């Protein structure tokens, strides 16, 4: 009833109205939402990412139910954390997606289940524009919200009751969030506005 | 404040890789980065635990874990005799090609299965006469390493110190 394509269709489509049957199917057969027969084979892309890339006006209603099944089956720190396992989107979790989609409705929800506020997107895509890459934000979720002008998420990840990320965490190269901002620097007056407004927030 | 390394523990399948990772984690086949916190010498370090498949010919997915690995844990089993010698055969030449030069702390769990009268009669029928520490100590000398802590999973006192000698090697150069 539930192969890979039939459901990745559903979660992209945005329907938390028709997949009633995951739990009595995914519990009687004793499988899980992170097994290899329920992921895209190249990336590692699970549902919870596919919902967040295929977002309807800031609201996909198929993250909440999914996590409820992942609990009632039992996996949150393995379903939420499941990173991409490819050499061009490495590290990227749901959180790394929920911040570049500028979706704060769900970062409050991810972190509330203890996802990972220090994962590292080491992939060749998330790698500077001198290496064969496009965009370097550091490698952390905090450094992405900081290097994408989101004072409302930076002020979440460092003041949560659940999980309090720290500005001083250290990527796979050394560059703190503060020395990411001076690594994404195209000297406009829009770039250098929020950089100095965000570099003066953390320090 | 902390630093964090990646741990890509290796074995030969059913050597007890995963049941170890349970015991260190909480205090049952997959472990993604279940980021565990350990105080090595006054640093409060996180340690990312990439458990790998085994002998399920998952070479499809096996090499996708080794990049940026720095604390390898080549398992064997004490109730596994020279079947143990997949280390220079399969697993050491494979981490020789998919991670250039990193530590290799050789596990060796199920230390509470020597003095196992039950499987003694089994392994006695096998003729194989299970391993000696000096036997794998030479395997340790053979490879180059940063420890040969044996290990133990069901009976504790043997999970903790294995990560000490492991972590400390990752904090070294490279
Ligand atoms: N008696 C005993 N069994 C153990 C010990 N450690 C692991 N096992 C057994 O190992 C089995 C599964 O080991 P696992 O780590 O999944 O093997 P893997 O395939 O190498 O991951 C379980 O049935 C455990 O009973 C131990 O210290 N004592």
Author numbering:
A (entry chain A): 148 to 350
B (entry chain E): 2 to 28, 36 to 182
What did the article's authors report about this structure?
To improve the quality of this density, we performed symmetry expansion of the particles, followed by particle subtraction, local refinement, and 3D classification and revealed two distinct groups of the hTRPV4 subunits, with and without a binding partner. The final high-resolution map of the hTRPV4 subunit with the binding partner allowed us to unambiguously build a model of the small GTPase RhoA, which is known to interact with TRPV4 channels in vivo. Thus, RhoA identified in our structure is an endogenous protein expressed in HEK 293S cells that was carried bound to hTRPV4 throughout purification. RhoA molecules bound to the ARDs of hTRPV4 are positioned adjacent to the membrane with their C-termini facing the membrane’s intracellular leaflet. The quality of our cryo-EM map allowed us to unambiguously identify the endogenous molecule of guanosine diphosphate (GDP) bound in the RhoA ligand-binding pocket. The GDP binding pocket is the same as the one identified in GDP-bound crystal structures of RhoA24. The interface between hTRPV4 and RhoA is formed by five loops connecting six ankyrin repeats of TRPV4 and β1, β2, β3 and α2 regions of RhoA. The strongest contacts are established between polar residues of TRPV4, including R232, R237, D263, R269, R315, and R316, and side chains and backbone carbonyls of RhoA residues R5, E40, E54, and D76. Consistent with our structure, previous studies showed that neuropathy-related mutants R232C, R237L, R269C, and R315W disrupt protein-protein interactions between TRPV4 and RhoA13. Mutations of the residues R5 and E40 in RhoA, which form salt bridges with D263 and R232 in TRPV4, respectively, have been associated with different types of cancer. In addition, we introduced the R316A mutation that resulted in increased baseline calcium uptake, consistent with previous studies of neuropathy-causing mutations at the TRPV4-RhoA interface, and dramatically weakened activation by 4α-PDD, providing verification of our structure and strongly supporting the inhibitory role of RhoA in hTRPV4 function.
